[PDB]
Protein backbone atom coordinates (compact mmCIF):
# COMPACT_ATOMS: atom_id res chain seq x y z
CA UNK A 1 0.00 0.00 0.00
CA UNK A 2 2.84 2.46 0.72
CA UNK A 3 3.85 4.04 -2.65
CA UNK A 4 6.71 6.20 -3.94
CA UNK A 5 5.87 9.93 -4.12
CA UNK A 6 9.04 11.14 -5.85
CA UNK A 7 12.79 11.02 -6.58
CA UNK A 8 14.87 14.18 -7.13
CA UNK A 9 18.50 15.25 -7.79
CA UNK A 10 19.10 18.89 -6.74
CA UNK A 11 22.45 19.44 -8.54
CA UNK A 12 23.01 16.48 -10.82
CA UNK A 13 25.48 15.00 -8.30
CA UNK A 14 23.43 13.35 -5.50
CA UNK A 15 19.75 12.20 -5.30
CA UNK A 16 17.03 11.15 -2.87
CA UNK A 17 13.74 9.16 -3.13
CA UNK A 18 10.62 9.47 -0.88
CA UNK A 19 7.53 7.36 -0.20
CA UNK A 20 4.16 7.76 1.62
CA UNK A 21 3.61 6.46 5.14
CA UNK A 22 3.51 -4.77 6.89
CA UNK A 23 6.59 -4.38 9.12
CA UNK A 24 9.22 -1.74 8.25
CA UNK A 25 9.32 -0.57 4.64
CA UNK A 26 12.63 -1.16 2.84
CA UNK A 27 14.17 0.36 -0.31
CA UNK A 28 16.34 -1.68 -2.72
CA UNK A 29 18.09 -0.30 -5.84
CA UNK A 30 19.86 -1.66 -8.94
CA UNK A 31 22.09 0.22 -11.44
CA UNK A 32 24.35 -1.07 -14.24
CA UNK A 33 27.67 -1.16 -12.30
CA UNK A 34 22.01 -6.19 -9.08
CA UNK A 35 19.90 -5.47 -5.91
CA UNK A 36 21.33 -3.63 -2.87
CA UNK A 37 19.51 -2.10 0.13
CA UNK A 38 19.26 1.72 0.50
CA UNK A 39 22.60 3.03 1.69
CA UNK A 40 21.17 5.80 3.95
CA UNK A 41 17.67 6.01 5.44
CA UNK A 42 18.24 9.16 7.59
CA UNK A 43 19.81 12.08 5.65
CA UNK A 44 16.76 12.94 3.48
CA UNK A 45 14.27 12.58 6.36
CA UNK A 46 11.46 10.17 7.17
CA UNK A 47 10.38 7.58 4.57
CA UNK A 48 13.34 8.45 2.34
CA UNK A 49 16.66 7.11 0.95
CA UNK A 50 19.71 9.34 0.26
CA UNK A 51 22.31 8.59 -2.41
CA UNK A 52 25.55 10.52 -2.15
CA UNK A 53 27.96 11.35 -5.03
CA UNK A 54 29.66 7.96 -4.79
CA UNK A 55 26.38 6.24 -5.97
CA UNK A 56 25.31 8.83 -8.58
CA UNK A 57 26.13 8.71 -12.27
CA UNK A 58 24.52 10.42 -15.30
CA UNK A 59 23.31 8.60 -18.40
CA UNK A 60 22.84 5.14 -16.67
CA UNK A 61 19.37 3.83 -15.63
CA UNK A 62 18.44 3.21 -11.96
CA UNK A 63 15.58 1.02 -10.73
CA UNK A 64 14.21 1.14 -7.18
CA UNK A 65 11.74 -1.14 -5.36
CA UNK A 66 9.81 -0.51 -2.14
CA UNK A 67 9.33 -3.75 -0.14
CA UNK A 68 7.28 -4.91 2.87
CA UNK A 69 7.26 -8.17 4.86
CA UNK A 70 4.97 -9.75 2.27
CA UNK A 71 6.74 -8.52 -0.88
CA UNK A 72 7.29 -5.69 -3.39
CA UNK A 73 4.79 -2.84 -3.01
CA UNK A 74 6.09 -0.25 -5.58
CA UNK A 75 8.71 0.15 -8.36
CA UNK A 76 10.24 3.02 -10.36
CA UNK A 77 12.94 3.34 -13.01
CA UNK A 78 14.68 6.63 -14.02
CA UNK A 79 17.91 8.29 -15.12
CA UNK A 80 19.44 11.11 -13.08
CA UNK A 81 18.79 13.82 -15.74
CA UNK A 82 15.06 12.95 -15.76
CA UNK A 83 14.85 13.73 -12.01
CA UNK A 84 16.96 16.96 -11.78
CA UNK A 85 14.98 19.72 -10.05
CA UNK A 86 17.22 22.54 -8.94
CA UNK A 87 17.12 24.36 -5.61
CA UNK A 88 15.84 27.92 -5.92
CA UNK A 89 17.79 31.08 -6.51
CA UNK A 90 18.70 33.07 -3.39
CA UNK A 91 19.58 36.66 -2.48
CA UNK A 92 16.74 38.32 -4.42
CA UNK A 93 16.93 42.14 -4.52
CA UNK A 94 15.41 44.92 -6.67
CA UNK A 95 16.33 48.49 -7.62
CA UNK A 96 14.74 51.28 -9.69
CA UNK A 97 15.51 51.15 -13.41
CA UNK A 98 13.79 54.29 -14.85
CA UNK A 99 15.04 57.78 -13.94
CA UNK A 100 11.80 59.79 -13.51
CA UNK A 101 10.76 61.62 -10.36
CA UNK A 102 7.06 62.24 -11.20
CA UNK A 103 5.60 59.09 -12.77
CA UNK A 104 2.51 57.29 -11.53
CA UNK A 105 4.35 54.17 -12.75
CA UNK A 106 7.88 52.81 -12.36
CA UNK A 107 10.10 50.13 -13.87
CA UNK A 108 12.41 48.04 -11.69
CA UNK A 109 15.24 45.53 -12.21
CA UNK A 110 15.21 42.32 -10.11
CA UNK A 111 18.36 40.25 -9.53
CA UNK A 112 19.38 37.01 -7.86
CA UNK A 113 22.04 34.38 -7.48
CA UNK A 114 22.00 30.71 -8.60
CA UNK A 115 21.53 28.08 -5.84
CA UNK A 116 24.93 27.52 -4.14
CA UNK A 117 25.14 23.73 -4.78
CA UNK A 118 24.88 24.02 -8.62
CA UNK A 119 28.08 23.90 -10.67
CA UNK A 120 27.46 26.62 -13.23
CA UNK A 121 31.01 28.05 -13.34
CA UNK A 122 32.66 24.84 -14.64
CA UNK A 123 29.84 23.68 -16.89
CA UNK A 124 28.26 20.71 -15.04
CA UNK A 125 24.86 22.48 -14.94
CA UNK A 126 23.20 25.15 -17.19
CA UNK A 127 20.12 26.83 -15.67
CA UNK A 128 17.11 28.76 -16.93
CA UNK A 129 14.91 30.81 -14.54
CA UNK A 130 11.18 31.65 -14.47
CA UNK A 131 10.14 34.83 -12.58
CA UNK A 132 6.56 35.50 -11.34
CA UNK A 133 5.10 38.67 -9.72
CA UNK A 134 1.71 40.12 -8.63
CA UNK A 135 0.19 42.90 -6.47
CA UNK A 136 0.17 41.63 -2.82
CA UNK A 137 -3.65 41.63 -2.65
CA UNK A 138 -4.08 39.51 -5.80
CA UNK A 139 -4.57 35.70 -5.80
CA UNK A 140 -3.10 35.01 -9.24
CA UNK A 141 0.55 35.54 -10.27
CA UNK A 142 1.70 36.91 -13.65
CA UNK A 143 4.25 34.55 -15.27
CA UNK A 144 7.19 35.64 -17.43
CA UNK A 145 8.84 33.47 -20.10
CA UNK A 146 12.03 31.81 -18.87
CA UNK A 147 15.43 33.54 -19.18
CA UNK A 148 19.11 32.61 -19.02
CA UNK A 149 20.41 35.48 -16.88
CA UNK A 150 20.25 36.17 -13.16
CA UNK A 151 18.54 39.54 -13.57
CA UNK A 152 15.58 41.07 -15.48
CA UNK A 153 13.36 44.19 -15.56
CA UNK A 154 9.72 44.27 -14.47
CA UNK A 155 7.89 47.16 -16.17
CA UNK A 156 5.01 49.54 -15.42
CA UNK A 157 4.33 48.85 -11.73
CA UNK A 158 1.99 51.36 -10.02
CA UNK A 159 3.93 53.33 -7.35
CA UNK A 160 0.78 53.33 -5.22
CA UNK A 161 0.67 49.53 -4.90
CA UNK A 162 2.86 46.92 -3.15
CA UNK A 163 4.16 44.01 -5.28
CA UNK A 164 5.85 40.65 -4.59
CA UNK A 165 8.18 38.57 -6.80
CA UNK A 166 9.38 34.92 -6.76
CA UNK A 167 11.77 32.91 -9.02
CA UNK A 168 12.42 29.19 -9.70
CA UNK A 169 14.99 27.30 -11.83
CA UNK A 170 15.42 24.31 -14.11
CA UNK A 171 18.27 22.56 -15.93
CA UNK A 172 18.06 23.37 -19.64
CA UNK A 173 16.05 20.83 -21.61
CA UNK A 174 15.67 18.24 -18.80
CA UNK A 175 14.04 17.36 -15.46
CA UNK A 176 11.52 19.83 -14.06
CA UNK A 177 11.39 23.25 -12.38
CA UNK A 178 12.24 23.16 -8.63
CA UNK A 179 10.58 25.13 -5.80
CA UNK A 180 10.15 28.92 -5.77
CA UNK A 181 12.62 31.19 -3.96
CA UNK A 182 11.47 33.13 -0.87
CA UNK A 183 9.23 36.02 -1.91
CA UNK A 184 10.71 39.47 -2.43
CA UNK A 185 8.42 42.37 -1.48
CA UNK A 186 8.49 45.55 -3.66
CA UNK A 187 7.40 48.86 -2.15
CA UNK A 188 8.14 51.85 -4.45
CA UNK A 189 8.65 55.40 -3.11
CA UNK A 190 5.83 57.79 -3.97
CA UNK A 191 4.84 61.43 -3.69
Amino acid sequence: EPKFTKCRSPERETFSCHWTDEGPIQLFYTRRNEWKECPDYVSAGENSCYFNSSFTSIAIPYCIKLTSNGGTVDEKCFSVDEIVQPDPPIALNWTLLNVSLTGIHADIQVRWEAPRNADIQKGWMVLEYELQYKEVNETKWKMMDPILTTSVPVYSLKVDKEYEVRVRSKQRNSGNYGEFSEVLYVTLPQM
Binding site: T30, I60, P61, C63, C77, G123, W124
Partner: protein
Protein backbone atom coordinates in the same frame (compact mmCIF):
# COMPACT_ATOMS: atom_id res chain seq x y z
CA UNK B 1 44.71 34.38 -31.34
CA UNK B 2 41.33 35.14 -32.92
CA UNK B 3 38.76 35.04 -30.10
CA UNK B 4 37.03 31.64 -29.73
CA UNK B 5 33.76 32.89 -28.32
CA UNK B 6 31.92 32.98 -31.66
CA UNK B 7 32.87 29.38 -32.61
CA UNK B 8 31.98 28.03 -29.11
CA UNK B 9 28.62 29.86 -29.29
CA UNK B 10 27.83 28.30 -32.65
CA UNK B 11 29.00 24.77 -31.67
CA UNK B 12 26.92 25.02 -28.41
CA UNK B 13 23.76 26.06 -30.28
CA UNK B 14 23.88 22.84 -32.39
CA UNK B 15 24.82 20.59 -29.42
CA UNK B 16 21.91 21.91 -27.33
CA UNK B 17 19.50 21.47 -30.25
CA UNK B 18 20.66 17.85 -30.75
CA UNK B 19 20.28 17.23 -27.00
CA UNK B 20 16.79 18.79 -26.94
CA UNK B 21 15.63 16.83 -29.99
CA UNK B 22 16.94 13.55 -28.49
CA UNK B 23 15.31 14.19 -25.09
CA UNK B 24 11.88 15.23 -26.46
CA UNK B 25 11.77 12.39 -29.02
CA UNK B 26 12.64 9.78 -26.40
CA UNK B 27 9.97 11.14 -24.00
CA UNK B 28 7.17 11.27 -26.65
CA UNK B 29 8.00 7.76 -27.85
CA UNK B 30 8.11 6.27 -24.32
CA UNK B 31 4.79 7.97 -23.32
CA UNK B 32 2.97 6.78 -26.45
CA UNK B 33 4.29 3.26 -27.08
CA UNK B 34 5.73 1.77 -23.88
CA UNK B 35 3.56 0.62 -20.97
CA UNK B 36 5.17 0.81 -17.47
CA UNK B 37 5.93 -2.95 -17.17
CA UNK B 38 7.84 -3.08 -20.44
CA UNK B 39 9.67 0.08 -19.25
CA UNK B 40 10.79 -1.59 -15.99
CA UNK B 41 11.93 -4.75 -17.80
CA UNK B 42 13.84 -2.63 -20.35
CA UNK B 43 15.53 -0.37 -17.74
CA UNK B 44 16.31 -3.23 -15.31
CA UNK B 45 18.25 -5.10 -18.00
CA UNK B 46 21.94 -4.26 -18.50
CA UNK B 47 21.35 -0.41 -22.02
CA UNK B 48 24.86 -1.30 -23.21
CA UNK B 49 24.79 1.03 -26.26
CA UNK B 50 26.90 0.37 -29.37
CA UNK B 51 28.99 3.41 -28.21
CA UNK B 52 30.26 1.71 -24.99
CA UNK B 53 33.71 1.18 -26.54
CA UNK B 54 34.17 4.98 -26.25
CA UNK B 55 35.17 5.73 -22.67
CA UNK B 56 32.76 8.37 -21.26
CA UNK B 57 33.15 9.83 -17.73
CA UNK B 58 29.80 10.12 -15.93
CA UNK B 59 30.18 12.22 -12.75
CA UNK B 60 31.41 15.75 -12.26
CA UNK B 61 34.81 15.05 -10.68
CA UNK B 62 35.92 12.46 -13.25
CA UNK B 63 34.74 14.55 -16.19
CA UNK B 64 36.46 17.73 -15.03
CA UNK B 65 39.79 15.84 -14.52
CA UNK B 66 39.92 15.29 -18.32
CA UNK B 67 41.83 17.77 -20.54
CA UNK B 68 40.12 19.98 -23.14
CA UNK B 69 41.39 17.90 -26.05
CA UNK B 70 40.28 14.62 -24.45
CA UNK B 71 36.72 15.96 -23.89
CA UNK B 72 36.55 17.34 -27.45
CA UNK B 73 37.94 14.03 -28.84
CA UNK B 74 35.36 11.94 -26.97
CA UNK B 75 32.63 14.32 -28.23
CA UNK B 76 33.94 13.95 -31.74
CA UNK B 77 33.79 10.12 -31.64
CA UNK B 78 30.26 10.13 -30.13
CA UNK B 79 28.92 12.40 -32.92
CA UNK B 80 30.68 10.37 -35.64
CA UNK B 81 29.23 7.11 -34.23
CA UNK B 82 25.70 8.39 -35.08
CA UNK B 83 26.29 9.47 -38.74
CA UNK B 84 25.21 6.06 -40.13
CA UNK B 85 22.87 4.73 -37.40
CA UNK B 86 20.67 7.85 -37.29
CA UNK B 87 19.08 6.64 -40.56
CA UNK B 88 17.54 3.79 -38.49
CA UNK B 89 15.42 6.38 -36.62
CA UNK B 90 13.83 7.50 -39.89
CA UNK B 91 10.36 6.12 -39.10
CA UNK B 92 10.63 7.15 -35.44
CA UNK B 93 11.30 10.80 -36.34
CA UNK B 94 8.77 10.97 -39.21
CA UNK B 95 5.89 9.83 -36.98
CA UNK B 96 7.05 12.27 -34.25
CA UNK B 97 5.24 15.47 -33.32
CA UNK B 98 8.56 17.10 -32.29
CA UNK B 99 9.21 20.14 -34.54
CA UNK B 100 12.35 19.53 -36.60
CA UNK B 101 12.71 15.80 -36.05
CA UNK B 102 13.56 13.94 -39.27
CA UNK B 103 16.62 11.78 -39.96
CA UNK B 104 17.75 14.23 -42.71
CA UNK B 105 17.58 17.23 -40.40
CA UNK B 106 19.35 15.23 -37.62
CA UNK B 107 21.98 13.87 -40.01
CA UNK B 108 22.69 17.51 -41.12
CA UNK B 109 23.10 18.69 -37.55
CA UNK B 110 25.55 15.87 -36.68
CA UNK B 111 27.70 16.50 -39.76
CA UNK B 112 27.74 20.27 -39.05
CA UNK B 113 28.75 19.64 -35.40
CA UNK B 114 31.48 17.07 -36.32
CA UNK B 115 33.21 19.70 -38.56
CA UNK B 116 32.89 22.37 -35.80
CA UNK B 117 34.42 20.10 -33.18
CA UNK B 118 37.29 19.35 -35.63
CA UNK B 119 37.96 23.11 -36.09
CA UNK B 120 37.91 23.61 -32.30
CA UNK B 121 40.45 20.79 -31.75
CA UNK B 122 42.66 22.49 -34.38
CA UNK B 123 42.53 25.78 -32.43
CA UNK B 124 43.40 24.22 -29.06
CA UNK B 125 46.17 21.94 -30.36
CA UNK B 126 46.36 7.97 -25.14
CA UNK B 127 43.98 5.26 -26.47
CA UNK B 128 41.27 7.85 -27.21
CA UNK B 129 43.36 9.52 -29.93
CA UNK B 130 44.08 6.00 -31.29
CA UNK B 131 40.56 4.51 -31.46
CA UNK B 132 37.84 5.14 -34.00
CA UNK B 133 34.11 5.72 -33.77
CA UNK B 134 31.65 2.95 -32.86
CA UNK B 135 29.66 0.76 -35.24
CA UNK B 136 26.06 -0.36 -34.85
CA UNK B 137 24.52 -3.83 -35.29
CA UNK B 138 21.75 -5.26 -37.47
CA UNK B 139 11.29 -3.50 -33.84
CA UNK B 140 9.68 -1.28 -31.25
CA UNK B 141 12.18 -2.35 -28.60
CA UNK B 142 14.84 -1.90 -31.25
CA UNK B 143 13.60 1.66 -31.74
CA UNK B 144 13.30 2.29 -27.95
CA UNK B 145 16.85 0.97 -27.40
CA UNK B 146 18.19 3.17 -30.20
CA UNK B 147 16.40 6.26 -28.89
CA UNK B 148 17.72 5.47 -25.43
CA UNK B 149 21.31 5.41 -26.74
CA UNK B 150 20.87 8.60 -28.84
CA UNK B 151 19.55 10.54 -25.80
CA UNK B 152 22.50 9.37 -23.71
CA UNK B 153 25.22 10.17 -26.28
CA UNK B 154 23.78 13.65 -27.14
CA UNK B 155 23.57 14.30 -23.36
CA UNK B 156 27.30 13.58 -23.04
CA UNK B 157 28.24 15.78 -25.97
CA UNK B 158 26.29 18.81 -24.70
CA UNK B 159 27.93 18.50 -21.26
CA UNK B 160 31.49 17.86 -22.46
CA UNK B 161 31.26 20.76 -24.91
CA UNK B 162 29.95 23.16 -22.22
CA UNK B 163 32.82 22.26 -19.87
CA UNK B 164 35.47 23.06 -22.52
CA UNK B 165 33.69 26.36 -23.33
CA UNK B 166 33.61 27.46 -19.67
CA UNK B 167 37.36 26.76 -19.31
CA UNK B 168 38.49 28.17 -22.66
CA UNK B 169 36.36 31.26 -23.04
CA UNK B 170 36.89 34.40 -21.10
CA UNK B 171 33.82 34.94 -18.93
CA UNK B 172 31.42 32.51 -20.60
CA UNK B 173 29.91 30.85 -17.48
CA UNK B 174 30.09 33.23 -14.47
CA UNK B 175 31.51 36.24 -16.16
Amino acid sequence: TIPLSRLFDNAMLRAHRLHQLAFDTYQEFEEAYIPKEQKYSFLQNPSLCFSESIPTPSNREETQQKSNLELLRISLLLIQSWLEPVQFLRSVFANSLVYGASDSNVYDLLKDLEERIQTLMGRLTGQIFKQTYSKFDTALLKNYGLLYCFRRDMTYVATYLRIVQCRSVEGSCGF
